[PDB]
Amino acid sequence: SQKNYLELIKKVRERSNPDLVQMTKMYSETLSGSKLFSIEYSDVSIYIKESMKGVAPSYTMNSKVAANKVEAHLKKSHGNLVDFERQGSVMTNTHILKENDVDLVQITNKSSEFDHKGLEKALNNTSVLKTEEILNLKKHKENFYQGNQIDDLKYVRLKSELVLSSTYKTVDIEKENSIYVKVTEPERDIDVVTATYYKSVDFMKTNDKSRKGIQIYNKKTGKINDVDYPFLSIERINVKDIISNRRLKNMIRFLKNIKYDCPHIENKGSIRSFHINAICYNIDVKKYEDLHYLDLVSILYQELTNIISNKSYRDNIKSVDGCEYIFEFDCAKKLIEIEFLSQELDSIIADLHNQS
Length: 356
Description:
This protein has helices at about 5-15, 25-30, 45-55, 55-80, 115-125, 130-145, 150-165, 200-205, 230-245, 250-260, 275-280, 295-310, 310-315, 330-355, and strands spanning about 80-85, 105-115, 170, 180-185, 185-200, 215-220, 225. Helix 1 (about 5-15) runs parallel beside helix 3 (about 45-55), helix 4 (about 55-80) packs across helix 7 (about 150-165) and helix 5 crosses helix 6 (about 130-145). Helices cover about 50% and strands about 15% of the residues. The protein starts with a helix and ends with a helix. The protein is built from 14 helices and 7 strands. The chain has 2 domains: about 5-55 and about 235-355; about 60-230, Beta Polymerase, domain 2, CATH 3.30.460. By secondary structure, the chain is α+β, with helices and mostly antiparallel strands. Strand 3 and strand 4 form a beta hairpin. The chain is globular. Strands 1, 2, 3, 4, 5, 6 and 7 form a 7-stranded mixed β-sheet that branches. The PDB classes it as transferase. The entry lists the keywords c-di-GMP, sting, transferase.
């Protein structure tokens, strides 16, 4: 191919590790070897490695420390009304830009939204339920607001604007769905999201904390957004990375880097981080958990090729949180981006073959 891997390495470095701090080597680097291909310090291999390893740890740590400092102020102000959590790709370390940050989420915890009809339906259909699920559902029904949910969200949003503006020099309070805080030690910009919980039937069956949803408050409309399950994506990616022998996240970061550097794909196009996560998460771990990192490029190429060629297969791939089919809408536009990504992987594989 005509790819310039020296230029690509410089680009990944500027985004990920400009000071060239020591990064932990992937274990297959020192313990394994490629079945398909000195190749490991070829330029193409170095590009693959640095694209897989992601952002230097100080940036990620600084983001989380900055968000912890913000949390302490909001908790002193009105911690009695909210729980604090985090969301974003930084929470799975699958971001690829050193400037990406965790978001801080504050969730009103006095009242919750929930699936009323679904709870009733589930409790009235006990023949399919495990006994522990019946008991969990029954307790949610038995324990089921004196105040005003929306008024509490508006209150927490405005109270947070006041506390943060009195604490930090630079705070953007004009965005609909978050407050943007410039923390100065460490110097990071943190978005503060205000939400309430949403309890799905699957949450109420299990009490798995990661299955709890949020509905984010929009300050401009005065309404709550549709439910999101950020903690479920985080938990499932982190768990499957462990099951995959610590390879899944390397595949996610690699594909995100390839997309970012591909001139044929818009940065904010039809395939986003959510879709890359879902495509990688859907790969059967047995196909790749023992492969050397270079052989993962071929696994990814095969998966994208199968998505392009096999309609029933692509039509049944779900998001990590299980709530959407990722090719149900805008399928043909998404496939253009998948096709350009597969062409980049084909070139990379060809260039590895030529180095060997």
